Write a protein that binds this ligand. Structure first.
Ligand SMILES: [Cu+2]
Ligand SMILES: [Cu+2]
Ligand SMILES: [Cu+2]
Ligand SMILES: [Zn+2]
Ligand SMILES: [Zn+2]
Ligand SMILES: [Zn+2]
Ligand SMILES: [Zn+2]
Ligand SMILES: [Zn+2]
Ligand SMILES: [Zn+2]
Lengths: 106, 106, 106
């Protein structure tokens, strides 16, 4: 099992998740870490996860704003997660296109 | 089973859900569709659903802001939903009285 | 079983939960009541509840803003709640340090 670190805010100051796209395998963890230009958060819309389960998208969403440097949030995409793409965004920086995509391999 | 379309924002530009009040039967779906003056969202307070279940109100709430024209969200009020009134509102337009009510018939 | 009333906003106008720290026993209820300077809400971060369960923190969080005088929200810390500290904050007044802590006794 691997852990993928996603920086929220690039080192240079770009309002992006870095890296934006990550492919994971069942059991892998994605760890988001507050990097530059907080606050950020991590939203998955109900229609943006495989099978469009609102329960799933809600449980994955960290809608609470993250302010502190190095503040982190992790999701383990375990065996019961459906394969497909999970597209997320940062609410504060939606206008800037601060978005990402986790692919659970099938 | 029927699907009731609720417009978020009237065609004229009134900040309302149209229609604001809908009566549904078990198995029916309510589909909210982004119509005018986005963003909107759909919040049910824990005390505003029958039996005051916070778990139920949370699961029905689409708190994520909806920005795009025609963006939609649906809830199927299935057999296990308690009869009674489910009162919701739009956070951005709470001040304008952008509110609605779904009645599940008993 | 006891109910602990926590005022959101002190009578004087301080932006605090009063009292900020409460110790509860299994079966006890905490009732938050809108007191001064609304809106307030009540957020528990996933890492701020015992065992860091995001499901638990989400279910305890009343993220919807509370505007009306006397508007209340209750949580019963029942037998299945893990012992330890549950640290929460108000989003609008995070900058002012409007924070609290519920201790479930073990
Ligand atoms: Cu951001
Ligand atoms: Cu609205
Ligand atoms: Cu407050
Ligand atoms: Zn892997
Ligand atoms: Zn949605
Ligand atoms: Zn019907
Ligand atoms: Zn409430
Ligand atoms: Zn007690
Ligand atoms: Zn968190």
């Amino acid at each position: 099992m691997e852990t993928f670190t996603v920086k929220m805010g690039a080192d240079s100051g770009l309002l992006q998740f870095e890296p934006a796209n990550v492919t994971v395998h069942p059991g892998d963890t994605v760890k988001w870490v507050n990097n530059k230009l907080p606050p950020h958060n991590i939203l998955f819309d109900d229609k943006q996860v495989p099978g469009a389960s609102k329960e799933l998208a809600d449980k994955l969403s960290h809608s609470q704003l993250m302010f502190s440097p190095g503040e982190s949030y992790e999701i383990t995409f375990s065996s019961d997660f459906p394969a497909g793409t999970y597209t997320y965004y940062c609410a504060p920086h939606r206008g800037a296109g601060m978005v990402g995509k986790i692919t659970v391999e099938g």
